[PDB]
């Protein structure tokens, strides 16, 4: 482990949140952004990149603003053909307005989720394994596919939670069947985790939560073991 493991009393208790879990749920539902082999078409601020990605299905957007943790990340991907994938939001998705601007009609926002296209593709779809423990008891386990060599943690986080939402009711309209939960991404000896439950209060900010993905943290699809730890509600 590299990042100190979450101590029990460090995790967000879902019961302390009283403001509709539907805002979290929505992020890990069937909808999300995905682009393959595309180049940025504009930029709002030094730390973001506007991608022409149309919502082929729902039709909610045409352009996606991808904000990063710093200017370096943006410049690094600016005018470079990459692949995009991530949980997006609309509420506080403020960007451009009209030409650093561009963008006419339908738009959404996200963080990180950028990876190079060439030299990162794989013939056969990789299959990582998720070990979910419910009060330590590892009752559930499933596989998460992909075909990128250096896949971002975000793409895996979405893929993992998605399964849990549909099969384990991870997130519900108003709350969750779990008190606490965190997803642990382990590579070699290094490991990092993310808190799956919202902060205390009566309101959830999708924008601030997702901002945890702005580091554009990538993981090696061959050296990754994912483990989800959940505590149930003591009914």
């Amino acid at each position: 482990e590299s990042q100190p493991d979450p101590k029990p009393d460090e995790l967000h208790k879902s019961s302390k949140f009283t403001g509709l879990m539907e805002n979290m749920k929505v992020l890990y539902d069937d909808n999300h952004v995905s682009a393959i082999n595309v180049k940025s078409i504009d930029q709002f601020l030094y730390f973001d990149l506007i991608y022409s990605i149309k919502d082929t299905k729902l039709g909610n957007y045409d352009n996606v603003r991808v904000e990063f943790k710093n200017k370096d990340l943006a410049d690094k991907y600016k005018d470079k053909y990459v692949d995009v994938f991530g949980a997006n939001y609309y509420y506080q998705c403020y960007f451009s307005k009209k030409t650093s601007h561009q963008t006419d009609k339908r738009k959404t926002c996200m963080y990180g989720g950028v990876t190079e296209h060439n030299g990162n593709q794989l013939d056969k779809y990789r299959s990582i394994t998720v070990r979910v423990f419910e009060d330590g008891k590892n009752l559930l386990s499933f596989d998460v596919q992909t075909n990128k060599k250096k896949v971002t943690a975000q793409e895996l986080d979405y893929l993992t939670r998605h399964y849990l939402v549909k099969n384990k009711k991870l997130y519900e309209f108003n709350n969750s069947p779990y008190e606490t939960g965190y997803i642990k991404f382990i590579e070699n000896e290094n490991s990092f985790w993310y808190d799956m439950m919202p902060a205390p209060g009566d309101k959830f900010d999708q924008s601030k939560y997702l901002m945890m993905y702005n580091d554009n943290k990538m993981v090696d699809s061959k050296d990754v073991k994912i483990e989800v730890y959940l505590t149930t509600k003591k009914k």
Partner: protein
Amino acid sequence: AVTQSPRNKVAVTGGKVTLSCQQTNNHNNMYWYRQDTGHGLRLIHYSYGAGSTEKGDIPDGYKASRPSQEQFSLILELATPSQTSVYFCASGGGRGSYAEQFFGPGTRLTVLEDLRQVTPPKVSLFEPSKAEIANKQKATLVCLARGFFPDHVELSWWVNGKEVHSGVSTDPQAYKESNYSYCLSSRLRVSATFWHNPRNHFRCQVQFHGLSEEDKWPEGSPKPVTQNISAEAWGRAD
């Protein structure tokens, strides 16, 4: 524009019900309220934008969903009599900032423990008398709709094929004449000569909204798919 779907709906207890709202104002904020005679206009759930769903004054027993900028739905998974109310949708400015909001026509929803309780109204035309007071005239023509249920009705007056408003004195809201039956009256004051002119034609329309094609009617009995009932008359001698 803010459109609501459906405009009227009668459902059984325990059934699922979903009310949709479509706006064309490109508003980030949208709301779902319920009007109740006694209580005011109460906010159930609102939205700040697509994918946003916040709870209002009374979220209890209601879910919601803002799949896009134009759609915001109110969901009742386990419909109950308590949810009988007229619902209003809006879009625009901030919560509590009505000067910025734009409302919809409203949706009448009634939750009853048996659709077979739904019965169309009985409309009739009458006429009072001065002998019936020590006052003056009060009102000439009188219309009374009764025996209907639920109370999804609209009453109007049409003299000579045209809708009138002058002299119309309709009841503020239907009253219950029994456990499962509503009543509703109206009065049309016209000139004695007008009423006495056999050439004039009067009409009391009553629009009742019961079950529809989307409603699951218990096969067997006749499905109450009535609509507009009228009570007509002509001017009588001097």
